[PDB]
């Protein structure tokens, strides 16, 4: 403690997560209000790294107005030495919140989906495919879920999963559909209290089972029938037959009643 951004001044409560060359702190301002300041040290970074940071602020900045399911950015500061991002602070990141709760209320799981849908929808409209969606990328604030990063800059962890990795990702060694899958696996996890491949732990065989057509996934018949359809359409292995976000936003699960 403590941090100084564009004239304003903040004291550091906790360290939420770490990069990267980056650190996220939960942060208190003068008026006892809570915030999230991400700090990037730019001393040990090449032009490829630097430019991905500049691209991140640009897009976070740009997308402010287009959806209230993108983490708010209040102000920022960039020099040749450092970057600070003053953002809204979340209650709990979806990952840890899914770990804590045993069963999820349906009306609450549908609301988080609409929310996950709107966010991802928004980035796609500005030509961004996350490519690496995980519940760690989402956050709860004032009822809603909110996307926090864009897969543009290097991912951070709390202070290395592949459950959600799409089949076409690993098969190629650029498609909106890749996000649809990962959103599916998240919805799956919220539905069947597990990711679809949680059973396996050996990577070389897990990454192999994601892509394996012979490896059939379970969809235990559940009350909400719309929901069972979304998961199926979402977790098709073939990108071109997998449901799209616009389709997914027109689906009876999100639309009926
Ligand atoms: O870097 C971020 N976005 C990129 C620039 C476009 C970013 C990172 C974290 C937050 C944020 C705000 N509040 C919380 C937040 N709030 C929960 C706290 C609250 C007090 O108890 C501990 C958790 C958690 C949390 N979890 C971690 C961050 C590091 C990587 C994995 C996920 N992130 N977070 C917002 C933006």
Curated annotation (Swiss-Prot):
| Top-rank taxon | Eukaryota
Q: Where does ATP bind?
A: 16-24, 38
Residue span, Protein kinase domain = 10-254
Q: In which tissues is it expressed?
A: Present in rapidly proliferating cell lines.
Active-site residues, Swiss-Prot/TrEMBL: 132 (proton acceptor)
Function statement:
Involved in mitotic spindle assembly checkpoint signaling, a process that delays anaphase until chromosomes are bioriented on the spindle, and in the repair of incorrect mitotic kinetochore-spindle microtubule attachments. Phosphorylates MAD1L1 to promote the mitotic spindle assembly checkpoint. Phosphorylates CDCA8/Borealin leading to enhanced AURKB activity at the kinetochore. Phosphorylates SKA3 at 'Ser-34' leading to dissociation of the SKA complex from microtubules and destabilization of microtubule-kinetochore attachments. Phosphorylates KNL1, KNTC1 and autophosphorylates.
Q: How does it assemble?
A: Interacts with TPR; the interactions occurs in a microtubule-independent manner. Interacts with MAD1L1 and MAD2L1.
Q: Which family does it belong to?
A: Belongs to the protein kinase superfamily. Ser/Thr protein kinase family.
> Protein name, please?
Dual specificity protein kinase TTK
Report which part of the complete sequence is shown. 516 to 794 of 857
């Amino acid at each position: 403690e403590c941090i100084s951004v564009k004239g304003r001044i903040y004291s550091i409560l906790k360290q939420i997560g770490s990069g990267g060359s980056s650190k996220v702190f939960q942060v208190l301002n003068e008026k006892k209000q809570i915030y999230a300041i991400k700090y990037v040290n730019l001393e040990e970074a090449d032009n490829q790294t630097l430019d991905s940071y500049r691209n991140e602020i640009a897009y976070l900045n740009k997308l402010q107005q287009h959806s209230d399911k993108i983490i708010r950015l209040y102000d920022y500061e960039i020099t040749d030495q450092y970057i600070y991002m003053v953002m809204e602070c979340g209650n709990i990141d979806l990952n840890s919140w899914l770990k804590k709760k045993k069963s999820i209320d349906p009306w609450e799981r549908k609301s988080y989906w609409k929310n996950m849908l709107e966010a991802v929808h928004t980035i796609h409209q500005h030509g961004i495919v996350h490519s690496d969606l995980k519940p760690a990328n989402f956050l709860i604030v004032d009822g809603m879920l909110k996307l926090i990063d864009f897969g543009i800059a290097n991912q951070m962890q709390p202070d290395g999963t592949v459950n959600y990795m799409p089949p076409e990702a690993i098969k190629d060694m650029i498609s909106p559909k890749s996000d649809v899958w990962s959103l599916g696996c998240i919805l799956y996890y919220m539905t069947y209290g597990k990711t679809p491949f949680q059973q396996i732990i050996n990577q070389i065989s897990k990454l192999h089972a994601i892509i394996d057509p012979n490896h059939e996934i379970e969809f235990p018949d559940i009350p909400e029938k719309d929901l069972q359809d979304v998961l199926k359409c979402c977790l098709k292995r073939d990108p071109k037959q997998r449901i799209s976000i616009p389709e997914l936003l027109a689906h009876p699960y999100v639309q009926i009643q």
